[PDB]
Structure formats: C-alpha cells, structure tokens
C-alpha cells in the first residue's frame, strides 16, 4: 500500500499507528514517517517509495549511523529497491537512487511511477501496456 513496497514486504506496512523498522526492529516510528522523505530507519525500510535512504549503500561516503547493523551508512539496505508494479507488463525493483531523478527509467519501471514527484517538471508516460 505505501508506494514502492513489494508484495513480499507488504505485511510490514500495516498498523494504524506505528511502523517498526523491518531489519532493525528496536527502532519504531510513527507511521506518518513512512515515505516522508526523511531516512528514519537505519536499514532504509521506512522509505520504500522515495530516494531518501539511497545513501545507505556500501558505495556511498561512510557516515556514522547509530542503529545501523554496521554502525554506519555503509550498510546493505533491507529493501531490495523501489517496486514498480507495472500493471500490464511485469513487476520489478529499481534502485532507490533512480527514484525522482528526473529520468524516466522505463526498462524496469515501465509504469513511470519512479517519477511520481515530477522532479524539475518531468512527466513520465505509463508504457507498460505497449511493451
């Protein structure tokens, strides 16, 4: 139901009131903090639908991160990526760092849902039904 969540992680996005971080479950959030463009879980799991936890990456500059499995941002996110359901074609994950970057990433996100915020004006078609 929140944007970018894949079927196999759906069950974690559920309550009314609170969200428990999936891979680091000692941190608990308000459910208003899901997809609010702040990275509030140190495993990235509160932002399935935005780019805001894309700095949680073994390739990105290391910064301290209390509650991270590694203690820093140099860590493997729980979620595989941002889920594009792609009705009419076939679903797939894309990297969080392709989300809202102004580029329509049609190969794996044919529904155009990676650019839902219209960064810098971009409007992506839904190309699923064609492909």
């Amino acid at each position: 139901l929140p944007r970018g969540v894949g079927p196999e992680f759906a069950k974690y996005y559920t309550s009314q009131g609170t969200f428990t971080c999936i891979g680091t479950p000692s941190i608990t959030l308000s459910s208003s903090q899901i997809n609010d463009n702040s990275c509030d879980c140190p495993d990235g799991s509160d932002e399935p639908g935005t780019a805001a936890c894309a700095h949680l990456d073994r390739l990105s500059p290391e910064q301290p991160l209390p509650g991270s499995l590694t203690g820093t941002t140099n860590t493997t996110s729980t979620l595989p990526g941002f889920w594009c359901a792609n009705e009419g074609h076939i679903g797939s994950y894309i990297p969080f760092m392709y989300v809202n970057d102004g580029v329509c990433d049609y190969e794996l996100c044919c529904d155009g849902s990676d650019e839902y915020a219209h960064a810098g004006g971009v409007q992506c078609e839904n190309r699923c039904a064609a492909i």
């Binding site: 500059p61 760092m97 580029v103």
Partner: protein
C-alpha cells in the same frame, strides 16, 4: 624532440652573463639614469626619460619610463625604447616585421584595474630622488632614485620590493650589424633543425627584483616543482638553470625541473609571517627567472654582522616592453584578488564540468562510447562527460568525423543526453593541408594562417601530417572559427557537445623545440618571438567565443579545456598539466602543480587521473582517484599504448573504493560549485594552500601536500605514497578538527597521525564552518539538480560557525541579472540562520520558481553542545511561518564527537530562515 638549455638560448646567456659581471665587479653601477628635468607627475602617473649609457664615449639612448599608481593600490612600471617607438631602426633581410616593441600584451590580458589614483602624491623630491605616497590612506610608498635608476616599494616602515638594487636592469637597445663584448648570439642562431633569421637583433629586457626579508617565493606556473620555488644558481638542493616560461610540448616531462611546460603565468608572490607582496611581469615572449637567496647587503660583511635574508630574482624576456605590476598586499588574498582584477577572475563554469570526466586516447567508435556509458551505470559509478581524442576525426581533419567508426554521432549524443551527460571532442589549431577539405581552403583564401619570416604561409608537421595553423591573433580568424562550430555546420554535434583544445603551444613536430620558428609572422606583423606565450590563449579565446551561441537564440557558458595558457586564461576555461606519467612520484607532484595554478589566478586545473603514460597498478590507480576528487578539474585519461582502465575494470574491492571516491566528489558538488563562485567573484583560489589560509603560521609556508576546499573548512591530505597506511597531517591552528567520515576529534598546531588504509581518504573538518552537500547518489550531476540539501554545521571552540551556498542554473548568463541563490549561513548562540549573501531585495525567472520546491532537509551539527541532550524538537521560522522539526542528539562516545541531526527541516533553499535549537 629536444629543448634549449639556458646556454643555448642566446638572450638567456647574455643576461646571465650580465649578472655574473655586475655581481663580481668593483662597485658596478647600472648605466641607466633618469634625466630628472624630463620628469613629471600628474594624476597618478610619473613620466620621464631614462638615459642608457651605451659605450665609454658617454653616448646615450632614450628609454621612456612610465610609473602608474593605480586606485587599487597596485603600481605599474613600464620602460619602452624611443628609437623603436619612432620607427628609426632598420630590419635585416628586408623583414616586414614590426619595428616597435610589442605592446599588445595588455590588450589580450588586462580587463580591469587600470584606473589611476588621483590621490597619489609626491611627498619628497630633491634632485637625486623622489618618493610618491599611494594606496589606501597613502600607506604605500615608492622611492624612485635617479642615478643610477632604482625603485624601492615600501609599506609598514620598510622596503618590501626593490627594482635594480643589484643593477641588472638590461634593455638591449637596437643596433646595426657592423664590422670592427661577445656578439656571437646577437644575430642568426640555430637549433633543432632551424635557423632563426633574427631581423631585429638583440632586444631583451631584464631586471632584478628583490623581495626584501622574504624567504619563500611562489608562482610562475607551470613547472614540475614545489610550490615554494627553488633557487636556480646551483648548490646542493638547488637547480642550476633558471625557471623558464616558453610554452612547449615536452614529451614525457620529468619531475623536479625548472624546464618549461605547456603554459606560463609570469606572476610571483612572496610570503612571510603576516606579510605578502607580489609582481606580475607582463610579457608574452620567452621568459626566464633566476632565483637566489641572499642577504639585503650587497657587500662582503664582517664576522657577526647580521643581514636580512632576501630573495633576489632576475627576470628576462626575449623582446617586448619591460612592464611589471607591483602588489603590496599585505595578505595573500589581497594579492590574488588585485591580480584577478587586472587579468580576470575565473569564468562561471558549466556546472557539469565539475563532475567526473572519462577519457582516453581513444574511444574507438560510437559503439565503444555507448558501451562505456552503459558500463559506468552497470557498475554504479557516476560520471558526467565522455571524451573523444583525435581518432574520432576523419584522418585528423578537424570538423569531421570518421564515418566508418563514428556512424551515428547524434545517436551517441542523445544516449548521453538521456542521463544529462555530455560529450567533449578535441579540436586543435593545425588544419590539414590536403584537398577536398573546405576548412583549409577557407583558412587559405581568407588569409587566416600563420606566416613565415617572408610572409608565405607557414607549413609544418603535426597529427595530420602536413598542416597550416590558424592565426588566432587575427580577429578575422576568430570570427571565422566561430562560424565553424554552429550545430548546423559542425555536423554531428549538438547541445551537449563541448570542446577540448590541445597542441596550442603551438606544437609543430618538425619545428625547433617542437614549436614554431621565432621569425614566423602573426597578424599585425608581430614576430612569433614577441607573442609566443599568448598563442595558446588566443586559440582558447577563439574556441570560447564559438561556444557562446551555436544556434539562433542560444546564449550559454562555454566549456573549453586547454593545454597551453597564459595570464588571463582563467577567463576562458580549464587547464590540465599535460602528459604526465603513471607513477607514484607524478601523483605526489600533481598536488603542488595544481595548487600553484590556483595561487597564480587560474584554479580550474587538474592532472590526468591514473597518469597519461604507462599502466598504473591497482593501488596507484585507486589512490589517484582519491587525489583526483580534489582537483577542480577531474578527468581520467590514458596514452594510446596504455591498457584500457575505465574505473570498473579495476575489479573488487578497488571498484568499491573508486566508486566511494566518485560519490564523495558528487556529494560535495554544492560546496565545489560555491568555491568556483568565489573564484569568479574575486579570484579566491578553489583549493587553498596553507600560506593562503594561514598567513600567521610560518611553518605552513612551504607546505604543499595538503589544502582546504573553498570556504568549507575541509582539510584534505590525500595519500600519495606506495603502500602507506597512515598519513601525518599538519594541523594549522588551535581550532577543533574532526574526521569527515567518523567525526572523531583529531588530537594547537602540530602533526597528527591518522589511519589511512587504501580504502580511506584523509579529510578533516575544521570547527567554525558550515558547508552544504547532497547525500543522495545519482548517476550524474544533472540528476541531482532537484534533490534536497544537507547542511553540515561544524562547531569549534567558540560555538560559532559560518558558511555559504551558491546555486544557479549552471548553464546560462542569467546570473548576471540576479537569477541565482546565494545563502550565508550563520550559527551562533543556539540559532542557525540563512540570509541572502549580499543582502539583496526584489523578480523571478523560470529556474528560480522551480527552485521553490528544492529544500534544505537535513542539518548535522558536529560538536553539538551537551545542553541539547533530551530536547527532541527545534523550531523553524521562515517567511512568516513557524513549525517544529525533530532533532536527535548523540552523545560523545570514545574518540567520536557529539553530534545532532535535524530531520525533515522542510525549508526551501532560497528562503530566509532561522532555526532555534536547545
């Protein structure tokens, strides 16, 4: 493939011998005097006649002297030769060359700063000498002595700079070749297969310039040399030949040499604890500078008699006017900023050009290029531009494509455009002499080519074989060049194509010293000897103007890289240090080179990452990425024989370390672009050496392996030695410094030893600063344009910090009309504020309107005060609204500082705000 040593350069020989004679004669006197009764002073300018005694009969020639005192506080001293101003000489070999001393260097180089100080005034003026007061509140003085001529430039109760104190002033006056002082270098001279016809004979201009009480001098790039320049008259640790500036294509240049490289900026500074001065020797001819460290006494002294240590420099140029500016500082910033006022600030760059540039000799086809582009994305390595070296052309004809290998250049271009990436294509000044080539037809029929001594078209060998050269001194050639780059004319280019200018020394493969004969003629009938060091710059100028507009209604920032350059080239684009070598010593050497570029007013500089020649080891390549992310201009490049080394080919775990370095560069791009802005505003260097940032610290003066980044307080010291796993950093002062990555407090000035394995970049944060970054990685800088900012607030001893952030559209000249955001950030007493940097008031174009949805979203406070523990919100005020944001406080732990993070600040980057903590 061979270079004059100083003994093989006839005028360098003569001037060094002039010094030998002066320095070891019984009270030598410079045979130059002011005829005082020709002297007059009005409206900031002294004017007189200098009489030079040319033989033992007491015969004289007249050398007009101008001394200007400028509103900036800078002085200018110029000496011409009246006989040549008047045409009253006769050239040899029926040369049509100009008779006057070249005097158009000003017109190419000087763009401002030339207003005379009507407030400068003669203070004392007996018959031996005069003293002029000038500069701010009349605290600068120049004492001009008549006989023998000398000038002493003073402030703060002492001499800082002296002209002719050792008596080495030498203006070689015109003289005929007649029968009956060694004259064997006066006329024809031969070297490198060539004979210089020398139609004017001797005409060099030289002068001794003493930096009184200074032990360190800096500048005159470009040389593979330390930042603090060496002595040149032999002895242990010293060079034996003077520093040379004669832009040349030097194959496999060596380390630690005063030999000339590809560009020259004849600007020197001298620094001691709390005092700086400088000179700029404005002359476009071949130039040498001898440097000796000596004493402020010309005599032999008794045992135990003290003298000030004094750097004596001896400057000499082949031809032209003697024309020198004098800068009295007193700070490093003062000197560079006054120099930039005269010669230009750094151009506002295309923002993309700060990203990572991927090049080699060559990507071999459009498909090769498309493959590299896809592979960068496959391996998650960000980049902005891919580069085409000379093999993209059809047979080394510029303005063509090899249509076998580059079949669809527009398609390649569009693929790059899809991730907002760019393409750069090389274009050089040698135009192939062949048929069915309209460009060379037009070069000839419009008479746009450089000529020989007798006026015929010059012909020589470069990459295409037989070639002619564009004479970019000719406005008509520049205006023709412009025409060739329109997208409609230069088929296969489009809006994301930019240009690399190379071989513009000019490099001529069968010429002497791999360049043009000195008696070639340029537009105006100047000799090549007159203008040589300006040649590259004219070419880059031509290309810059070509990129301003390449279709109707387009007006945008050029990007042009050059190899050869002069003073002023900071207005036109970027430089790199040429054909370096894949080796550890060249990695280390690149940092003092790139720094010397910046303090000489051309900071948009770098060196080839990985080294141009040869094959770097994986660890050398990896460490080179970690250095190269601190070059203002950051490009990987490789010679035609080197193996492929696109960074994803390195393999794990190197690939990961390399990607982390790239991503660090990208995350810091907001701060990098802001450093370029300041370079544009007033010539502030982009990376800054310790003499610049900390002029109060004597021990900083020579240091050239570490630097600060713009205005951020970030202190970098890249690892440049094989197998090293720690680094010793010199901590300049008593402020708190923190590791960038771990926030550990690093433990008054002194040497700190830090852990620095292969995977680690030594980068510290100084207390007292705010800088901006973007934490979200992206595939290129364009895909970052709409992402939120993080401010990092680094607190020191005083709980205060300040910094700034400049943003604009990265492309247009709309910044000229106010279309930009420039924020000043101040933290004091638990409050962080953002205000317009200039304090401006109102009308918004499209770009600014779109920036209304781009926010500061996160603030990190490093060294957060203990009082903040357990407070869970801050208050944010902006544009008459108020709201709360969450903050988490993290206590100090082990070596790590306490730090606090504010989340979802939610404030538009263009808006004033106040955030109240605690």
């Amino acid at each position: 493939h061979d270079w004059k040593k100083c003994d093989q350069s006839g005028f360098c020989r003569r001037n060094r011998a002039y010094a030998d004679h002066a320095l070891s004669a019984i009270s030598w006197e410079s045979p130059y005097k002011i005829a005082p009764e020709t002297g007059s002073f009005k409206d900031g300018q002294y004017q007189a006649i200098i009489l030079k005694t040319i033989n033992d009969h007491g015969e004289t020639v007249r050398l007009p002297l101008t001394v200007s005192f400028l509103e900036s506080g800078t002085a200018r001293v110029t000496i011409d030769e009246e006989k040549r101003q008047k045409g009253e000489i006769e050239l040899r070999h029926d040369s049509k060359a100009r008779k006057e001393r070249y005097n158009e260097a000003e017109q190419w180089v000087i763009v401002g700063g030339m207003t005379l100080d009507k407030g400068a005034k003669v203070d004392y003026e007996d018959k031996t000498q005069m003293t002029v007061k000038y500069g701010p509140s009349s605290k600068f003085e120049a004492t001009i002595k008549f006989a023998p001529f000398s000038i002493d430039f003073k402030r703060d109760g002492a001499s800082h700079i002296k002209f002719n104190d050792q008596g080495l002033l030498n203006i070689e006056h015109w003289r005929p070749k007649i029968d009956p002082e060694d004259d064997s270098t006066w006329w024809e001279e031969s070297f490198g297969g060539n004979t210089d016809s020398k139609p004017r004979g001797p005409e060099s201009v030289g002068l001794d310039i003493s930096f009184v009480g200074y032990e360190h001098v800096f500048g005159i790039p470009s040389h593979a040399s330390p930042l603090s320049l060496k002595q040149t008259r032999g002895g242990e640790g010293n060079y034996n030949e003077p520093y040379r500036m004669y832009n040349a294509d030097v194959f496999e240049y060596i380390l630690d040499s005063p030999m000339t490289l590809y560009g020259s900026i004849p600007f020197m500074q001298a620094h001691r604890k709390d005092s700086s001065v400088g000179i700029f020797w404005l002359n476009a001819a071949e130039t040498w500078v001898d440097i000796t460290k000596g004493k402020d006494s010309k005599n032999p002294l008794a045992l135990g008699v003290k003298s000030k240590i004094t750097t004596r420099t001896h400057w000499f140029s082949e031809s032209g006017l003697l024309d020198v500016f004098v800068f009295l500082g007193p700070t490093p910033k003062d000197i560079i900023s006054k120099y930039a006022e005269l010669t230009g600030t750094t151009a506002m760059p295309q923002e993309f050009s700060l990203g990572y540039h991927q090049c080699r000799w060559n990507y071999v086809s459009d498909e090769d290029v498309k493959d590299v582009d896809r592979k960068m994305d496959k391996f998650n390595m960000p980049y902005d531009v891919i580069w085409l070296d000379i093999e993209y052309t059809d047979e080394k004809k510029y303005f063509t494509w090899d249509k076998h290998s580059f079949k669809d250049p527009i398609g390649m271009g569009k693929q790059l455009e899809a991730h907002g990436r760019k393409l750069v294509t090389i274009i050089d000044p040698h135009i192939k002499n062949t048929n069915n080539y309209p460009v060379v037809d037009e070069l000839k029929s419009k008479d746009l080519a450089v000529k020989t001594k007798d006026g015929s078209i010059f012909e020589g060998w470069c990459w295409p074989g037989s070639s002619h050269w564009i004479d970019a001194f000719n406005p008509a050639a520049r205006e023709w060049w412009k025409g060739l780059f329109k997208y409609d004319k230069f088929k296969g280019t489009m809006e994301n194509t930019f240009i690399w200018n190379d071989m513009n020394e000019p490099s001529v493969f069968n010429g002497p010293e791999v360049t043009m004969p000195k008696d070639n003629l340029h537009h105006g009938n100047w000799e090549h000897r007159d203008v040589h060091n300006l040649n590259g710059m004219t070419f880059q100028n031509a290309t810059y103007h070509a990129l301003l507009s390449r279709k109707p209604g387009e007006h945008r920032r050029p990007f042009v890289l050059t190899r050869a350059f002069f003073a002023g080239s900071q207005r036109l684009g970027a430089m790199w240090t040429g054909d370096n070598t894949a080796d550890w010593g060249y990695l280390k050497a690149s940092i003092p080179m790139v720094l010397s570029q910046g303090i000489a007013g051309f900071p948009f500089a770098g060196a080839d990452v990985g080294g141009f020649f040869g094959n770097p080891d994986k660890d050398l390549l990896t460490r080179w990425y970690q250095t190269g992310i601190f070059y203002p201009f950051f490009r990987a490049h490789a010679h035609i024989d080197a193996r492929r080394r696109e960074p994803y080919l390195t393999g794990e775990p190197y690939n990961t370390i390399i990607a982390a370095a790239l991503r660090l560069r990208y995350s810091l791009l907001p701060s990098w672009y802001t450093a370029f802005r300041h370079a544009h505003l007033d010539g502030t260097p982009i990376i800054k050496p310790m003499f610049y940032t900390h002029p109060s610290e004597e021990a900083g003066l020579p240091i050239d392996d570490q630097f600060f980044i713009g205005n951020t307080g970030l202190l970098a010291k890249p690892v440049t030695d094989k197998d090293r796993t720690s680094v010793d950093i010199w901590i300049p002062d008593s402020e708190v410094y923190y590791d960038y990555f771990t926030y550990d407090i690093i433990s008054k000035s002194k040497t700190a030893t830090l852990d620095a394995p292969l995977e680690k970049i030594p980068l510290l944060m100084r207390g007292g600063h705010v800088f901006a970054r973007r934490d979200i990685p992206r595939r290129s800088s364009a895909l970052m344009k709409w992402d939120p900012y993080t401010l990092v607030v680094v607190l020191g001893n005083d709980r205060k910090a300040e910094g700034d952030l400049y943003v604009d559209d990265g492309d247009s000249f709309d910044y000229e009309k106010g279309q930009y955001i420039h924020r000043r950030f101040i933290f004091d007493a638990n409050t962080l504020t953002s205000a317009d940097y200039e304090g401006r008031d109102d009308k918004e174009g499209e770009w600014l309107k779109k920036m209304r949805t781009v926010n500061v979203e996160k603030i990190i406070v490093v060294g957060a005060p203990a009082a903040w523990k357990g407070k869970k919100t801050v208050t944010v005020e902006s544009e008459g609204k108020t709201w709360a944001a969450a903050i988490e406080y993290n206590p100090a732990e082990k070596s790590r500082a306490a730090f606090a993070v504010v989340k979802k600040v939610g404030v538009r980057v263009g808006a004033d705000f106040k955030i109240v903590f605690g």
